[PDB]
Design a protein around this ligand. Structure first.
Ligand SMILES: CCCCCCCCCCCCO[C@@H]1O[C@H](CO)[C@@H](O[C@H]2O[C@H](CO)[C@@H](O)[C@H](O)[C@H]2O)[C@H](O)[C@H]1O
Ligand SMILES: CN(C)c1ccc(O)c2c1C[C@H]1C[C@H]3[C@H](N(C)C)C(O)=C(C(N)=O)C(=O)[C@@]3(O)C(O)=C1C2=O
Ligand SMILES: CCCCCCCCCC(=O)OC[C@H](CO)OC(=O)CCCCCCCCC
Ligand SMILES: CCCCCCCCCCCCCCCCCC
Ligand SMILES: CCCCCCCCCCCCCCC
Ligand SMILES: CCCCCCCC
Lengths: 157, 240, 144, 457, 240, 48, 48
């Protein structure tokens, strides 16, 4: 925990691109994590700040960083329907079959909130469609339970 | 007679009766009011673009307009000419009997799976020494959509197949009641029947209502418009 | 107790706010629902309004809305007071020889002092900085 | 402290603050009342407050041992503290007013946009208001920011499969982690509450969730881990509403030199360019300042019109009254110079002080004009003869009153004790106004009467 | 008691052993919640926040509270101490004293300045009688309007000193001048003296009324403050 | 004026015989034909 | 209902009585708790 580390966490969350850039020049810690284990990339991927997500990965930010419950920036971006960020993460080597402590994947979360474009991007990068969570539930089991007609067709593969 | 004191005295006796009334009558909300029986004015609401139905308009007036008008000083009673939406679970007796379920099981499931739970905090007070984490625990929250209600699990069969609420009922967003249906010059309409509070000034109250309506107009959806089909105050203004 | 801002707002605050109709000379209404499980709805009235008549009208509309609140909230209680944030003085009670905790002192003031001070000639309202004792059961999950 | 900070974390900061006041300000500070977990902005573990009680004014000599001086010292001393926004400040005369330069703004959700969309619109208004330091200064949100919260999801299917009811699950969680008020008991003839809650150590961290077991219908004990799944998300620890609708209170004050009315007019302009469905309203002192400022012009008018009519009836002349009413600036100029020189403000004591200075100057002028006119009307004297005879007869009484009153308010001006602020405000402006009102009036009132009597023959 | 709560039976085992509430929980008398940690100079602290009742005397109430707390001293457990971190009545006592000091000093100065010019103790007595009569009269009218002795009302009379003192000086001084310039006896001199100013004094009262009265008709918080000064000054001026 | 109304008698003996709760009978009849207000939910951030 | 004077006074009469302080023109307050569970707290005010 450093002075600039806490400011980057605050800036990355708020989406202050120009403050993030000044902090990337001063050498602010990109691996700066809060008490829950969220890095600036975690925060940026959650709040949907694309320009900052790109700036952090350029500055050697861990794309496969995980919190105290095993969730990664891709989990968040996929869950909150941030297509542009999901692509940039997978492009920069984001583990598409990343499991949290519950065994939940970015595909599970993407499917659960009916993000059709994101599901297609994930499957394109080799997202295990037969991947189960701790309850033995697939992304297909989520679609039929939610009653998502379109999503059920995409995961029918 | 001071209508304020008359209301206080009447309710003091009502609160002795309140616990003896059925639980269903209490949960509908009993109301004590001191107003004229006649209507001061009727504030009609229509959609010129025909984008919203009679039901859709009524829900908007109930959810976005009614409460602020009801709180305005001088407004004794406000009658919604329509109904605010409710999560309507239209049960099917053929489908309920098929899965060996009853309206009793449906109500129990909704109360269990449409709950807003208080689950405390991580590192709550009094805490242990050396605690760094402090976060609220969020468990079950109120459902928000017809879909969420649809996927309420009533029971799991012996073969492991799930019975959801949408399998035994049609789930739409519909009026709390279907008793009131209004029309303005033939086309679909809703509105508010406003009764003047006992002793309140007709003209000062009517002006205060228009002031409150003026603050809502900018935030209306496309097509939605206020109309003035009935007002007793213009005569007083013009006659004087 | 144990509720979050969202839980408090969606079960308590919105239900009470929807029932604050038919009250005279109301200017505006504001509320806060926080993660301590607390809600405070402040109704500000026109200058010259009888504060007693204003309070009884708010209390009456709340009473009719009480059956719509959670049993946990109904059990705790909902307090309708006249917002007059202006103290005559603050009396502090302290333990110098460290034989009593802040909880132990609070119970003493509540039991032996508070009521006598409330009865004192010219005293309007007395707020206790703390609460009287509660029978605290601290459960062990390993044992259960 | 930063959001998510614990009670122990905040206690350490308060212990340093308490240590400072009883060390560095031992000669001034009598006691420090440290309240950990309370703040006027919103209560929580991260917030606290230290109420400092000082020794008698007798034991605190000079301006260096005043709250003004002690505040400035303490503020700078705590600015060094790592990861804590700690500062001191004096209490106002009353809470029931706030600041004259300050405004109170409500940002309203008028189309069920949601909490997150209203935050975006709030951040947008703040960002634009920050590009106007010339008009608006310290434009900030009054509420709390969203914080990490622990979302746990009960699997309904898995609970029903194991034979575990949701009532037993939701009770176990809520009771242990949140606490549960069961019923009453009578401790020494006093009814008191009974609470069941987990012993601290078993309800601190997410790993402790799995240590809690709920009995199934078959009688087997099932851990929470078996039928639950958790993740981190952000949510509000304090949700604000205004007139039934969701809102966010924004505080701020007019920039040095700029007026409240102007600062408000820009906030309205900025607010009109926010996302669709986002409304605004003025509350508290802003609501007051608005519908009090619309009266002022009307009250000044009536006051000035009735004064004229009263003097018109007295002198039996539509013109002569002007000779009296022209004395007003002579008393106001000295009040302003005195207040400005000393560095005081346009407060109520000053404003009422002007009206009493204007009152006594108007009184002096009325008698000079009355004497002068009555000599012309009865003794048939000339304008200049009567005016010179008048001011001669009226010189001594004007001086006696002024001499007595200037000396009478002199102790209030030099006062630096308890309630000196009020005394100074009452004194300074009156003494200053009286000097100019006395010195100038005796020479100007005869000038006004002659010029008016000439202009209107 | 905690002992009774400890002995609460939860279950009886098949072998015969009993499970009590003390076996699965720690049982103590504690606080309703543990959110606030209160300390006074580092020591554990509580307290009472006391507000003044409607129409009550602040100085009497404060003395009464201290008189009650004094009777509780003998029964306090070993280590318990009362402290007064906040109290306004010492400040309000200074405000009262400083105003009476100013009002008394003011009457003394009129006496000295009256003697300096007129140089007869007989003339110096007239304003020494008239001014206190008006100041007392002022309190009677404050009570009639239902006002209290407060910082605004007290300093309202301090600002009016100039107006009340003047009324006295103007009347006596004018009589002293008429006697000096005409040689009339005090009786006939007073008649002529008053005859010159009596019309102006009525006129002054009407002008000063028009200056201060409209100040009370401000609305809201600002209006309430100005109303205290307005009524105090107009009342004192009218009596003068 | 008075209107025709559908009087329905619940045979207590036959219900006790078959082992059906009269609470379940009144709930089933009342909820289905009359309507039952179960609890509240949140529609676009408003309690309904 | 069913509570003796002692239990009633402790749980009701005192709880109410200790909140009946700071009221305008209150002269005195008399109350009684009986074996039937009944409480009756009478507050008498100045004439006028
Ligand atoms: C509604 C508010 C408007 C009020 C404004 C008027 C301000 C006060 C004006 C005072 C009237 C001037 O009064 C001037 O002196 C006296 C009384 O004072 C008058 O004299 C008259 O009244 C006096 C009263 O004692 C009587 O003796 C006598 O009946 C009559 O001659 C003169 O005719 C007039 O020149
Ligand atoms: C400033 N303030 C009033 C203080 C000061 C010092 C304190 O030590 C305390 C307070 C607030 C009071 C409020 C009381 C209130 N009540 C009397 C039960 C109360 O409703 C709560 C609550 N969380 O609801 C408390 O925290 C509370 O018990 C508490 O712990 C307090 C407390 O400990
Ligand atoms: C002799 C004629 C005097 C005319 C002035 C009367 C002013 C009274 C206005 C009033 O009632 O408001 C008082 C107001 C309360 O906020 O107090 C004030 O703000 C004091 C007013 C001082 C300025 C006077 C105008 C001089 C400019 C040339
Ligand atoms: C356009 C805004 C309208 C506001 C009008 C306010 C009028 C207030 C009336 C004040 C009353 C003045 C009376 C003072 C007279 C006393 C002196 C004889
Ligand atoms: C607000 C209405 C009243 C204002 C004051 C009226 C003054 C009247 C002046 C009349 C002058 C007539 C001159 C005669 C030559
Ligand atoms: C200190 C006692 C005096 C109370 C009345 C004073 C009025 C100015």
């Amino acid at each position: 925990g450093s002075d600039l580390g806490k400011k980057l966490l605050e800036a990355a969350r708020a989406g202050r691109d120009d403050e993030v850039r000044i902090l990337m020049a001063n050498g602010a810690d990109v691996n700066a994590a809060d008490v829950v284990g969220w890095t600036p990339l975690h925060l940026a991927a959650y709040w949907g700040h694309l320009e900052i997500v790109e700036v952090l990965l350029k500055n050697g930010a861990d794309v496969n960083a995980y919190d105290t419950l095993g969730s990664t920036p891709l989990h968040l971006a996929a869950h909150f329907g941030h297509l542009e960020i999901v692509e940039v993460l997978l492009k920069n080597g984001a583990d598409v079959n990343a499991k949290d402590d519950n065994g939940i994947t970015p595909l599970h979360l993407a499917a659960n909130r009916g993000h059709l474009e994101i599901v297609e991007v994930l499957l394109k990068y080799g997202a295990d469609v037969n991947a189960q969570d701790k309850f033995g539930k697939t992304a297909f089991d989520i679609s039929i339970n939610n009653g998502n007609e379109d999503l059920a067709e995409i995961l029918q593969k | 007679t001071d209508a304020d004191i008359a209301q206080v005295q009447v309710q003091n006796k009502l609160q002795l009766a309140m616990p003896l009334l059925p639980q269903e009558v209490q949960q509908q909300g009993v109301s004590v009011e001191k107003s004229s029986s006649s209507f001061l004015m009727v504030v009609g609401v229509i959609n010129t673009d025909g984008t919203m139905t009679q039901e859709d308009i009524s829900d908007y007036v109930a959810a976005n307009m009614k409460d602020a008008i009801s709180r305005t000083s001088g407004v004794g009673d406000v009658q919604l000419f329509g109904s605010q939406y409710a999560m309507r679970i239209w049960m099917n007796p053929n489908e309920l009997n098929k899965f060996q379920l009853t309206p009793v099981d449906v109500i129990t499931a909704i109360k269990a799976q449409n709950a807003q739970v208080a689950a405390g905090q991580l590192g709550g007070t009094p805490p242990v020494k050396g605690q760094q984490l402090n976060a609220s625990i969020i468990a079950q929250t109120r459902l928000t959509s017809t879909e969420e209600f649809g996927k309420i699990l009533l029971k799991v069969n012996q073969d492991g197949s799930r019975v959801l609420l949408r399998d035994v009922a049609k789930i739409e967003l519909g009026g709390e009641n279907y008793d009131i249906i209004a029309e303005f010059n033939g086309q679909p309409a809703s509105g508010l029947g406003i009764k003047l509070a006992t002793g309140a000034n007709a003209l000062d109250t009517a002006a205060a209502i228009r002031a409150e309506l003026a603050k809502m107009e900018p935030f209306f959806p496309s097509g939605l418009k206020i109309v003035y089909p009935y007002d007793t105050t213009p005569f007083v203004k013009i006659s004087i | 107790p144990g509720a979050d801002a969202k839980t408090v707002q969606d079960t308590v605050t919105q239900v009470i706010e929807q029932n604050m109709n038919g009250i005279d000379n109301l200017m505006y209404m504001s509320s806060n629902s926080d993660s301590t499980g607390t809600v405070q709805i402040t109704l500000t009235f026109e200058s010259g309004t009888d504060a007693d008549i204003a309070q009884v009208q708010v209390q009456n509309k709340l009473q009719l809305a009480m059956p719509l609140l959670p049993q946990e909230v109904q059990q705790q209680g909902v307090s309708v007071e006249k917002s007059s944030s202006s103290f005559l003085m603050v009396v502090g009670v302290i333990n110098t020889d460290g034989t009593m905790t802040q909880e132990d002192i609070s119970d003493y003031v509540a039991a032996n002092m508070k009521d006598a001070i409330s009865r004192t000639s010219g005293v309007g309202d007395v707020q206790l900085f703390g609460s009287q004792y509660a029978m605290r059961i601290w459960m062990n999950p390993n044992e259960l | 402290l930063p959001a998510g900070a614990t009670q122990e974390r905040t206690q350490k900061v308060l212990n340093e603050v308490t240590h400072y006041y009883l060390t560095k300000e031992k000669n001034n500070v009598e006691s420090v009342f440290a309240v950990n977990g309370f703040g006027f902005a919103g209560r929580g573990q991260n917030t606290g407050i230290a109420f400092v009680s000082l020794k008698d004014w007798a034991d605190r000599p000079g301006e260096e041992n005043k709250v003004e001086a002690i505040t400035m010292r303490a503020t700078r001393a705590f600015s060094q503290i790592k990861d804590a926004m700690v500062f001191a400040f004096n209490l106002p005369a009353t809470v029931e007013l706030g600041t004259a330069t300050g405004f109170d703004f409500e940002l309203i959700d008028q189309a069920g946009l949601g909490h997150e969309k209203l935050t975006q619109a709030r951040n947008q208004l703040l960002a634009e208001a920050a590009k106007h330091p010339d008009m608006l200064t310290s434009v900030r949100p009054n509420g709390l920011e969203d914080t990490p919260q622990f979302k746990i999801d009960i699997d309904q299917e898995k609970a029903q499969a194991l034979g575990v009811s949701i009532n037993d699950i939701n009770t176990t969680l809520g009771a242990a982690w949140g606490g549960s008020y069961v019923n009453d008991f009578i401790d020494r003839g006093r009814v008191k509450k009974v609470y069941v809650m987990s012993e601290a150590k078993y309800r601190m961290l997410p790993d402790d969730i799995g240590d809690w077991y709920v009995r199934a219908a078959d009688g087997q004990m099932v851990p929470f881990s078996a039928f639950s799944s958790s993740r981190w998300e952000y949510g509000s620890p304090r949700l604000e509403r205004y007139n039934g609708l969701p809102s966010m209170e924004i505080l701020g004050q007019a920039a040095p030199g700029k007026s409240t009315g102007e600062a408000m007019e820009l906030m309205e302009q900025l607010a009109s360019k926010l996302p669709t469905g986002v409304g605004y309203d003025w509350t508290g002192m802003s609501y007051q300042e608005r519908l009090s400022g619309n009266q002022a012009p009307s009250l000044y008018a009536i006051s000035l019109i009735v004064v004229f009519l009263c003097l018109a009836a007295l002198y039996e002349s539509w013109s002569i009254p002007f000779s009296v009413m022209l004395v007003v600036p002579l008393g106001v100029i000295g009040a302003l110079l005195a207040a400005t020189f000393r560095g005081l403000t346009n407060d109520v004591y000053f404003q009422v002080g002007l009206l009493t200075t204007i009152g006594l100057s108007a009184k002096n002028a009325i008698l000079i004009v009355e004497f002068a006119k009555d000599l012309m009307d009865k003794e048939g004297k000339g304008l200049i003869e009567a005016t010179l005879d008048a001011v001669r007869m009226r010189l001594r009484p004007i001086l006696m009153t002024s001499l007595a009153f200037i000396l009478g308010v002199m102790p209030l001006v030099i006062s630096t004790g308890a309630g000196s602020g009020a005394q100074n405000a009452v004194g300074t402006g009156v003494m200053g106004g009286m000097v100019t009102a006395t010195v100038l009036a005796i020479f100007f009132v005869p000038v006004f009467f002659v010029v008016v009597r000439r202009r209107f023959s | 008691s905690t002992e009774e709560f400890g002995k609460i039976l939860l279950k009886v085992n098949q072998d015969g052993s009993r499970v009590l509430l003390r076996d699965v929980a720690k049982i103590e008398l504690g606080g309703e919640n543990y959110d606030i940690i209160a300390e006074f100079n580092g020591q554990p602290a509580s307290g009472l926040g006391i507000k003044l009742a409607t129409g009550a005397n602040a100085l009497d109430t404060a003395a009464a509270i201290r008189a009650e707390l004094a009777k509780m001293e003998p029964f306090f457990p070993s280590g318990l101490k009362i402290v007064y971190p906040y109290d306004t009545t010492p400040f309000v006592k200074i405000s009262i004293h400083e105003v009476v000091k100013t009002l008394v000093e003011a009457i003394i100065l009129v006496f000295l300045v009256m003697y300096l010019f007129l140089q007869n103790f007989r003339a110096t007595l007239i304003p020494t009688i008239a001014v206190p009569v008006v100041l007392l009269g002022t309190f009677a009218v404050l009570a009639a309007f239902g006002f209290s002795i407060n910082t605004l009302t007290m300093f309202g009379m301090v600002l009016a000193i100039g107006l009340l003192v003047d009324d006295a000086i103007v009347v006596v001084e004018n009589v002293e001048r008429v006697m000096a310039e005409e040689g009339l006896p005090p009786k006939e001199a007073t008649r002529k003296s008053m005859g010159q100013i009596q019309g102006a004094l009525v006129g002054i009262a009407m002008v000063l009324s028009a200056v201060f009265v409209p100040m009370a008709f401000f609305g809201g918080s600002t209006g309430a403050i100005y109303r205290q000064f307005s009524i105090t000054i107009v009342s004192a001026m009218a009596l003068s």
